[PDB]
Amino acid sequence: KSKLPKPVQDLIKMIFGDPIDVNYEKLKTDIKVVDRDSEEAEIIRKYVKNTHATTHNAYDLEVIDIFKIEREGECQRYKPFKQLHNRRLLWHGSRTTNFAGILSQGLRIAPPEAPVTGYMFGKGIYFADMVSKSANYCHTSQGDPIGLILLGEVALGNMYELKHASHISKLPKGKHSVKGLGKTTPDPSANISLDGVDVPLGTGISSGVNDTSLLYNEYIVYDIAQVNLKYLLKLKFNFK
Ligand SMILES: NC(=O)c1cccc2c(O)c(Cc3ccc(-c4nnn[nH]4)c(F)c3)oc12
């Protein structure tokens, strides 16, 4: 019998399809249930509510559970970046079958042999500031409507801001990350701070950017150490 809280037990069952507690240990990740009544949960629910894109209208999202996560080794790996400016709490979606690998190994860059199709700024680690842009990568359906999504603190520093696909060979001098500029942005006036990290939970507005290939922002880092995975949400997709 498992000694984990029931929501964590259910998460492990979802991730692994060995005893529950043995599978938990394979993830090398501390997993804590976030209290529904907390400041953290209120912020995260608002981020989900406010940043669902008007063009992603096939479904709406219901948050079932929020977990706080701490990967083994993360404290030391992230330390060089924890003092960089412009650290932002951003979305990353993936198929459920990828999460055992993501939690144990962290987010990784696609290897040389994988196609570059789907990556407009080359192989890196990609995030959104609009929940639905990332939720689309969960590849849920009516028949299979529960997905998992991550929130990471991403150390962006000085962003190399681009509007059209470009597989850059190197970051320019002093730049730490790429930001793809979309036509729509969470309203920047509404940014708040959660534990020293910026949370862009404003409702979507026109960015006023013209001559861009993107409907919505995206953020890319090219060093796996620039990512501090912090929350994992279990989402219900309510298809319309
Ligand atoms: N994942 C996100 O939340 C996210 C947020 C913002 C922008 C993007 C963006 O362009 C991608 C790209 C992507 C995702 C998955 C695969 C894949 N291949 N095989 N299995 N999965 C891939 F080839 C490319 O992901 C994004």
Resolution reached, in Å? Answer: 1.7
Please indicate if the annotation marks 134 as binding a ligand.
yes
- Ligand 1 centroid from CA 220, angstroms: 11
Ligand 1 close to Cβ of residue 218 (< 6 A): yes
Q: Which domains does the chain have, with CATH numbers?
A: 1-240 (3.90.228.10)
Determination technique for this PDB entry?
X-ray
Contact predicate 145/238, CB 8 Å: yes
Burial (Cβ within 10 Å: 0-12, 13-18, ≥19) of residue 89: buried
Question: Exposure string (b/e) for 178-213, b if CB count within 10 Å is 16 or more?
Answer: bbbbbbbbbbeeeeeebeebbbbbbebeebeeeeee
Catalytic residue positions, numbered:
218
Ligand 1 close to Cβ of residue 91 (< 6 A): yes
Tokens of 198: 């910026």
Query: For residue 129, what are the CA distances in angstroms to 29, 115, 124, 216?
Result: 24, 25, 17, 8
SS3 track for the chain:
CCCCCHHHHHHHHHHHCCCHHHHHHHCCEEEEECCCCCHHHHHHHHHHHHCCCCCCCCEEEEEEEEEEEEECCHHHHHHHHHCCCCEEEEEEECCHHHHHHHHHHCCCCCCCCCCCCCCCCCCCEEEECCHHHHHHHHCCCCCCCEEEEEEEEEECCCEEEECCCCCCCCCCCCCCEEEECEEEEECHHHCEEECCEEECCCCEEECCCCCCCEEECEEEECCHHHEEEEEEEEEEEEEC
Q: Which of 48, 107, 126 to mutate to test the pocket of ligand 1 (most atoms within 8 A of CB)?
A: 126
* φ, ψ for residue 225, nearest 5 deg: -70, -10
Nearest one of 30, 19, 14, 5 to 104, comparing CA atoms: 30
Ligand 1 close to Cβ of residue 74 (< 6 A): no
- Ligand 1 centroid from CA 113, angstroms: 16
Sequence-ordered list of residues with C-beta below 8 angstroms from that of 25, at least 6 positions apart, any chain? none
Please indicate if the annotation marks 196 as binding a ligand.
no
**Atom 16 of ligand 1: nearest residue by CA position:** 118
- Ligand 1 centroid from CA 117, angstroms: 10
Tokens of 121: 């700024």
